[PDB]
């Protein structure tokens, strides 16, 4: 039997098309996964190819949680350390955030989506170590979904990386993956450190995946990601009434691609929703403002369809 849940598929399709029309965008995609099994509950595309599977995108800020998790897991940082997060250059090439934060702890780096902080954490590992880590997340590794024209993605050989390139990859530029690959990676955070394979068929038990992070690390990171959707984070547009939502929002230059990805309930996740809107031309272009609202409606609605009870009182 197919894992597709038609109630969620129809919701996803409805909310995607609305957002695409309202922002006058070229295209968009939604992926909804069962966060404990990897089953694909919904896969929605605007007319044309199955972009969720075929189109490789730069993940942008959506990759940062993994870099943070890896630094914590390897003991290269902790939740007390305060990093200098002033903008800097490596030779001619700058690394900067949206604002100048003189210093941030790891929670702050997640909350404010600090390119600087994330890049410094990545720089505590060798290029080869980071390369293997990205390959372990499935980047550059075809999923063999069954759809023709499927993308493998892009992960350059570590021996060819400049120091600036390692930094830019850590905040999601210079490597590429499909939205389905990116949604898959998020199972490593939701399923307590264990990356799941993904399926188009129903699974009566969670498949055997593979461990990327310690369980403690994944739990800590999910808690950090809730800061993204609360006041003071970049992703308040994707807050869902009644729930704590862990999320990341992203905006990549190609013209932009606006991305919002997250899971709920954050502590014991049931659903991953990933939304990408390609080239919005009206009413903003950032991931929070463009992809946040459809994420909010798709996540809130999925949680209701699936019968998950709110964990905090509704407002």
Curated annotation (Swiss-Prot):
Pathway: Cell wall biogenesis; peptidoglycan biosynthesis. The keyword Glycosyltransferase does not apply. It is an enzyme of class 3 (hydrolase). One of its GO terms (cellular component) is plasma membrane. Its main location: membrane. It catalyses: Preferential cleavage: (Ac)2-L-Lys-D-Ala-|-D-Ala. Also transpeptidation of peptidyl-alanyl moieties that are N-acyl substituents of D-alanine. Catalyzes cross-linking of the peptidoglycan cell wall at the division septum. This is Probable peptidoglycan D,D-transpeptidase PenA. The gene is penA. The chain holds residues 237 to 573 of 581 of the full protein.
